[PDB]
Symmetry: D2
Subunit: 325 residues, 4 copies
Amino acid sequence: RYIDLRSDTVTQPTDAMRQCMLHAEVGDDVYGEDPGVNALEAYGADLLGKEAALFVPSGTMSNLLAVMSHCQRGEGAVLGSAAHIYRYEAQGSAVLGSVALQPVPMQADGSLALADVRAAIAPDDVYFTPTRLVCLENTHNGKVLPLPYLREMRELVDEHGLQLHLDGARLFNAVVASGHTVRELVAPFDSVSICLSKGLGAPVGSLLVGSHAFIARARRLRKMVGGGMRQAGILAQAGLFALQQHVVRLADDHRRARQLAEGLAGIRLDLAQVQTNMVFLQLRAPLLAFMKARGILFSELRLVTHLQIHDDDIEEVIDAFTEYL
Amino acid sequence: RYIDLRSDTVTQPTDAMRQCMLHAEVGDDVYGEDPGVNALEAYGADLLGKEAALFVPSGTMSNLLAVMSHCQRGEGAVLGSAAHIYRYEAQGSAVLGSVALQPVPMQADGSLALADVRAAIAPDDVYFTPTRLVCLENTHNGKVLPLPYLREMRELVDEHGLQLHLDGARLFNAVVASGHTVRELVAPFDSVSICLSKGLGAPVGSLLVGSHAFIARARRLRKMVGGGMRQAGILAQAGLFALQQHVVRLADDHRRARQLAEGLAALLAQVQTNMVFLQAPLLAFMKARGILFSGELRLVTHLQIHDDDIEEVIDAFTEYL
Amino acid sequence: RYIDLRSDTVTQPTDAMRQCMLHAEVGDDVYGEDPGVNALEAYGADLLGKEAALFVPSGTMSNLLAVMSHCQRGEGAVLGSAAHIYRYEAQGSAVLGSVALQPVPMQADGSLALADVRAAIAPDDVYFTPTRLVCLENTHNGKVLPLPYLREMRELVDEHGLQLHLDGARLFNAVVASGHTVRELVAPFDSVSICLSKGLGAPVGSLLVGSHAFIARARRLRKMVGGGMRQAGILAQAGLFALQQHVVRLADDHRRARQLAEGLAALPGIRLDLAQVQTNMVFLQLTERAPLLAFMKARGILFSGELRLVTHLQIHDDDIEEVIDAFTEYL
Amino acid sequence: RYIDLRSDTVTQPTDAMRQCMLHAEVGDDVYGEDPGVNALEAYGADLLGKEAALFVPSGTMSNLLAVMSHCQRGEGAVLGSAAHIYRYEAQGSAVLGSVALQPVPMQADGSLALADVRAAIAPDDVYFTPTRLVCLENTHNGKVLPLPYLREMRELVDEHGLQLHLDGARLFNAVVASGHTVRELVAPFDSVSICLSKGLGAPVGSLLVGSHAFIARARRLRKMVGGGMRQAGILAQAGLFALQQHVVRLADDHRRARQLAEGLAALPGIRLDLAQVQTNMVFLQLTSGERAPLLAFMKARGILFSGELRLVTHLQIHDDDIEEVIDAFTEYL
Ligand SMILES: Cc1ncc(COP(=O)(O)O)c(CNCC(=O)O)c1O
Ligand SMILES: Cc1ncc(COP(=O)(O)O)c(CNCC(=O)O)c1O
Ligand SMILES: Cc1ncc(COP(=O)(O)O)c(CNCC(=O)O)c1O
Ligand SMILES: Cc1ncc(COP(=O)(O)O)c(CNCC(=O)O)c1O
């Protein structure tokens, strides 16, 4: 028995979810003949109020396809320096996609300073290959992107005729925490990546959502990168289950994280950045070893709660920290 | 309700396979903690007599990762012009991996002429970025590569200190049909891609097999291309089931494929496994008879094609004249 | 004191050409303010009957910029397997430009079989990133591309909505040899690369010619690859000189190459196809290559799978007779 | 004639340089048989105290080849966000070379904070393709990179097993201004790009300098990108002339830049930091008023320069030219 607070990616499929997977109807998705994948994508597109959706094996591929579908060779994509697309995806957009990544300083709430983005945007000129895309992240390290800011960024992106992509790997965490609908949070975006394999608890994959044309380009690029699966409907049906059954209960992950951060408050902790299911802490190797020895797992120290974290688990790791001091 | 001879990719997971998936133990594969994936990779590496294995969502990615792990920016990979990596994978190796694809003419048996490969190989020179890889395909359009040729190609690549990669998407078809063990057919290769999502009947994915160092590079690139999954043990366990339970019965696909070609004696040396090649109005009639298939017409048999299906499509062809 | 038959690239600038360079007016080409470059480009574009032209340090960059301006990421370019763009430019179009190179068998006259090309073309589909370009080469190994063939390829390219690019590194050799003007030979093409640094005798560079939009893309890509020079008018003026003064005399290079092939095809032990001598190249085989090259090099005679001898303005009549004697001496 | 303070790239070849070009011996550089190019490369490599040198048509290609020769596919190169390699070369190293560019904040003197560099460095790992290169710039917007800082960065890169590349497009400006020789200033670097087509006054090209192995790779990539010229010895000999004859006189460009800046900073409506005038550049902003009306006014009087107004001095800028644009500014304000 381990208390795994390393990430919400360690979520296991519930028995009800496994049961759903057992009876999932499948087909060849390359021929577009998997009813499970078709259902998830149809449901996903409508849920976010967009035209089309595309199922992919990972959030990394979801973003990778997103940037390559917005930007061609040499074209620019502006994003945060602390964004996952920049920091934790091996710069695949540049290395594989020949896209010019244009990092700008990222703020606490995950916002990019309008002045920084505007200064970063390169025009379509004689010697300048134009910026084409701006990327945002919601949530960003468990923090919710403020909606008034989002509207302003949409305005800036429109001013230069650019596109707007959302890394919403933990979008529904922002939905539940802020109290705004998913429609309201993705309305200013042209494209959205949502991960099904974190808090939502599905075992594999993410969904890329956007316009028909955008998704059409992403689907062709998905084949090239190796994302074109066959009978993925079993996976897709699990992802569909997650969206229908595992969104509301995310509030508990937020509560236990809030309850965890409060208890841990020799530990420096800012409760203002505990807005969803993450707790960031600062005082390292002896601590991790100590915790490891007590069946407690995490990785600035980051603690993430999920559906396989329970009330007693929280109290055990609060005890463990107290004991450590 | 349809007789689907389009591809062996339309294979559905058996109920027994679904049960295996239901009870599969999983974990976060990125942390390497998925017991289902680890088991498949361990079994696969051992089955082919290699050091390590890597589970990926598709055969396209398996090959894509393979040449990029063999060939760095500007470096060359020699393969067949009719090879899947060249013709049917959007040249991802070049576009994404900056690898110089070096297609050579493909022979009847699916082999690459030794003279062509020798002539294609570019040395490590002042203005030449060296060829680093040679790719083969077994099977290729259902045809089995002769083993003496395989050992011989190994000799050629060794002569230039190169690597040898096998697209064995349909390797086990070649195993069953030729009568050689899997070990004998993958021995000349440095790396092997085997597809689990075709004849073997698993719903998703392939296995890339090779040395520890090679797979280590492939595993790093898998993360970049977006192949890094979480609880893929459910998928992996199905792949494990397929390898353990669905290899022997591939002979039936070969039997039904051969009997199909035999039946088309109205109005054959390339029928060695589960494919039948023949040379729009035709498609309309066949579709109307619940018959689905795909310049040259390709008919593919698999575990959801039965004896009555075969004679039914033979009847359609005869009736069509 | 060497007889250099290795290539027509070893051509040195004449004193007249040097004088022209000395008095060349220059400026910052990045600002488009070099009168020498602009003059060469204006003249070059007009000579080939296209809208715009771009001066580049090499024919390799000329072709590299050409396919990348025709083909974006993942898009396809059909070419000959023996074409320079495929065989001798390190596949930069693919490695650097993410262009899908699509080789088809290349014939003797440099033509690509329409059936082979038609079979290679990938449509704009759900899973197929479209072919966008077909590349041809004139001359190809000193051989002239047949003009009737071009019209038919032009037909095919229009039928599939593609572009057509000509590697005319030695185009003016084909002009002199065939008796057709340069305009007639580039008319079916959307874009043309011509090399100034071979038979024409300019010391550096090539010209990429095409539409305004195409060149605009090529000019921006030139900056990225590092081809954007400053006061290149000195080089450009030499190229203008070459185009104005060194085209007609290519007939002599062809004559000396033909007389060379005649002399060597008499000698026993020599295999030589005189039908392949149409311009300034002689391809030959012994009935080993390396011992011959060392033997020739020691006698101040330089050339290079198949033995290739290339004539240019620094080859004279006596030079031809000396290497004929040398082969005779060697055999 | 125009008084062109837009850039030092507009430098024209002197008659002496043109004479040198006329008598330049040439050959096919691809065969390595151009005596003019070989001489320039030999002289240049020794001048910077490195093993080998490579002649290229531009500084962009010099840097482009540099990063790709240090960094393989997916590998990382750390540089300044205000560095030319990042901002003004279309990210060719990334787009063409598949190199992961890693910008960090760049300071006034062109230095990168070591803490920022340490945070940027990715190790050779199971999932991070390692950083391989750190890039610096001297001069940077005409500022001179402090040598003690350089020593510290060398320590950092050795500690992490990285390479160090200098964009020394205006290195010799830093040489004259700081009083340190070119050898001392490039000693900590593994590779150096020097531009011949600016202050040095040669019409075309740059030199990439480094180890034999590094240059051998660069020479191969040069062929691929299209930098392999034939008889470029005429250009190279001009570059050789520039290095031998036009380095010392860079001090005059610096004097005229300072005299220019002093005259303009004595005018109301001008914001000018005289501490940022260390070489041949003067950066100024109006306090206030738009930039474009000033430029149009100046252009109409045969005066040319260029977000922030930048004035660059060179060998075709003379004292009377300087006094004339001060008068024009005075007249305009
Ligand atoms: C914000 C964000 N975006 C994209 C991804 C990539 O998704 P995949 O890992 O499914 O490719 C992650 C994964 N983040 C892992 C973690 O936070 O532990 C993420 O946190
Ligand atoms: C020999 C071969 N190799 C690789 C692949 C690609 O694998 P995925 O499709 O799983 O990515 C295929 C697909 N072949 C499809 C067919 O023959 O119908 C194939 O036939
Ligand atoms: C047909 C053709 N096209 C393009 C090029 C490339 O041009 P540069 O070498 O200027 O980059 C060459 C060079 N051919 C050299 C020879 O055959 O000797 C060529 O022969
Ligand atoms: C610091 C620096 N680095 C590299 C380059 C590129 O060199 P080429 O322009 O020769 O490619 C320049 C040109 N800078 C032009 C200017 O500042 O006006 C530069 O100033």
